[PDB]
Symmetry: C3
Subunit: 262 residues, 3 copies
Amino acid sequence: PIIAYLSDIGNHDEAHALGKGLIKTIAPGAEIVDITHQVTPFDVREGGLYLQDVPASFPANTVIAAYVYPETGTSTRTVVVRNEKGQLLVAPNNGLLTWALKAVPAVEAWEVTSPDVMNQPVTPTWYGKDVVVACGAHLAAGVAPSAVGPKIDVAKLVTLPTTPAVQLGDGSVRGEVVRIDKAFGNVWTNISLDALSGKTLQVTAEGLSVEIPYYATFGEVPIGEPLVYNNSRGKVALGLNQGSFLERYGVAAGDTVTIGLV
Amino acid sequence: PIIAYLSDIGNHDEAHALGKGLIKTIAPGAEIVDITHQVTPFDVREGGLYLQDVPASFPANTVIAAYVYPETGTSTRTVVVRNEKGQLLVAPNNGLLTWALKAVPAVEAWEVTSPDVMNQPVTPTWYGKDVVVACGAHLAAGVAPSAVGPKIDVAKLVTLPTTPAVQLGDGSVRGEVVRIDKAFGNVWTNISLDALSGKTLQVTAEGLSVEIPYYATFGEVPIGEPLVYNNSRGKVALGLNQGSFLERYGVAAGDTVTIGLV
Amino acid sequence: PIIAYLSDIGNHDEAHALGKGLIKTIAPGAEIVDITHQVTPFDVREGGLYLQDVPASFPANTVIAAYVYPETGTSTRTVVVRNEKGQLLVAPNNGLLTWALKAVPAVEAWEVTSPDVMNQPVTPTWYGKDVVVACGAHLAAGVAPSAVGPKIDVAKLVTLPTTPAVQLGDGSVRGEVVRIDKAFGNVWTNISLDALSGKTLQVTAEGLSVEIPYYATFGEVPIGEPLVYNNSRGKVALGLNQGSFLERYGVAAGDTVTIGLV
Ligand SMILES: Nc1ncnc2c1ncn2[C@@H]1O[C@H](CCl)[C@@H](O)[C@H]1O
Ligand SMILES: Nc1ncnc2c1ncn2[C@@H]1O[C@H](CCl)[C@@H](O)[C@H]1O
Ligand SMILES: Nc1ncnc2c1ncn2[C@@H]1O[C@H](CCl)[C@@H](O)[C@H]1O
Ligand code: MET
Ligand code: MET
Ligand code: MET
């Protein structure tokens, strides 16, 4: 069994590793694979976006244990979700799993109430470790999901709002910068390729209007010059060959962007 | 067997991983779990604080291999310590293990002198890899601790000084900021809750004097507002709900802080 | 089997971990050991330098899967190399493996052409995951190297240029700062000790000329003062005891440096 592990606690001190110690105590045979622990502090949306493509990439016998949990020690509970692939996801019921479940939908869910899957005495400021990680490790060790607490309708899993890309009427699409690919400065939108229907495109945002060609990969434009492309996760992206589209055009996550032909 | 691994060498290049290569060469069956490699360069105190809670969180069959070793290649030796839980700790004898052993005390110790647990030819500027990690991997592979070198009285393990919290006489406690919880800006003191005996508290430091209520977790105060709480490791902490108490009040590690009722 | 994994994609989000998911899907029994994912974006030279000492440190049954692949989705292919130790290396054929193969030379090589070792449909902007990592995992799972595609003469592996240290005639050596040891600010040159033949040395670069003694380790000079030493990888290095030689003298990677006796 594999536990895929994400938090916003950072990798710069022992905290994230104390969770790993707990995993090994409960499930010594579980293989721990970090997703990241560098989610922006308290940023449930950034964390959930990071989780979107994890289900498709990991084996079906994976437990995804993930928390960005500024609600720790409150009425906000942790949930377990079995998705269509056979994976189990454990997380605060705060919208963290919105995109992972869009990608690979939930078939059953449960609320985590049983102390026998918790690390007691649970500390109020770290439910991330003592409820989420603890329960993920019990699932990895073979505890049945239904033994964590009551079933709950898939419909009661909290979701955060997602802005659809909208076709405007002439052929251009008004959408949104979903995230920055921060290592490189590439800009990832929510605009699907099949929504625009070796052509060129007009791209519009508050800062500017530029004409940019479409290519399959960075190297099909000269160093420093821009391209629109289809990114690894199926959506329209903006970049510069071996440069930072973020720094040059100052785009930001959440900025409305409008894209259309010629 | 689990090797829990900490250094100040960073995770930004291959150096920390070359230790992992050495572990796998000596003990292919050992599971490597990083603690962190981002300890501040040369900061034995920060490293040792990071190690304090590792013994309680990890299984008893764990070897804690840890170095912040600006004394590498000198007369400062490496030691092996068996603690009350059955874990083995390997580290420079430079105070790095002060807090881990406060938390879970040493029952026996040894000086590392036998070359058969060293990666020879030992390089003078990296005893961290060639003595500490190498010996940790031999311990993980089954080498007996007594085979590393001479026994030494627990009393000769080097410790760094620790400032006790002092009750002043009226009911307030003069203490010290032990560390900053850097991902979030929470401030961790050495003041125990049972030392202050839903109340409010006066907190005093050089920068300021403010009145702050006590709660069990961040979410019991509105976003942006301060709380005193009991942190996950048993000590009094200062934070802001989804904010940085460090940045707002400018507190620092090592600052004397005084806290008392109403 | 061990997969040693390097990229320039960063560890701050899920991308590097999606490769790990793919590894576990193809080779669940493979142990994944990160080298680093913090190579500077697009910096093939920095990545290859990081890989130089990996072959010697890792077991012979290691697959080194490494990519800094700004050529992804282009005619630049991925290669498999068996080196003298029995390890397999998988990487873009773009010079990334120059130094790893200097250190432990290639005995056979192959071009990766067979789709049966690729993660199809390969995405054009991430050959790093879908060709390099995918093929590394198949090798770890037992696929034979010759089954990846056509053999190629070791001579056709792309290399990047390396500047030799040159003895100038009087006894001083003109060389080059190969890399900065970034955690600490130590300066690593390409000058061999046996090329200079408890003495003192004159060190010359554009910024300055200073006299610096030679010692085996940092602690043999007082805190804050400079030393020339032999670093862990066999070359002449410049540092300050518990300080940053980079910040004090402003040296940089690629700066010509000249060193000689008295
Ligand atoms: N000052 C603070 N205010 C609100 N939430 C905080 C916090 N410090 C840590 N957490 C939150 O504690 C969780 C562990 Cl359960 C992390 O996920 C973090 O999001
Ligand atoms: N310029 C320098 N001065 C003093 N100590 C140094 C150093 N560079 C690395 N180390 C020290 O070398 C150790 C590996 Cl044995 C690290 O733990 C580091 O603390
Ligand atoms: N805007 C960009 N321009 C050129 N190359 C880029 C890029 N963004 C990512 N990569 C390159 O994509 C690889 C994955 Cl195959 C990484 O190794 C990276 O070097
Ligand atoms: C930017 S890293 C290269 C691959 C990335 N997944 C993309 O499609 O933009
Ligand atoms: C600040 S991260 C949340 C948990 C942490 N251990 C604390 O008690 O402050
Ligand atoms: C600078 S980290 C200490 C060891 C390093 N490998 C060196 O020789 O400079």
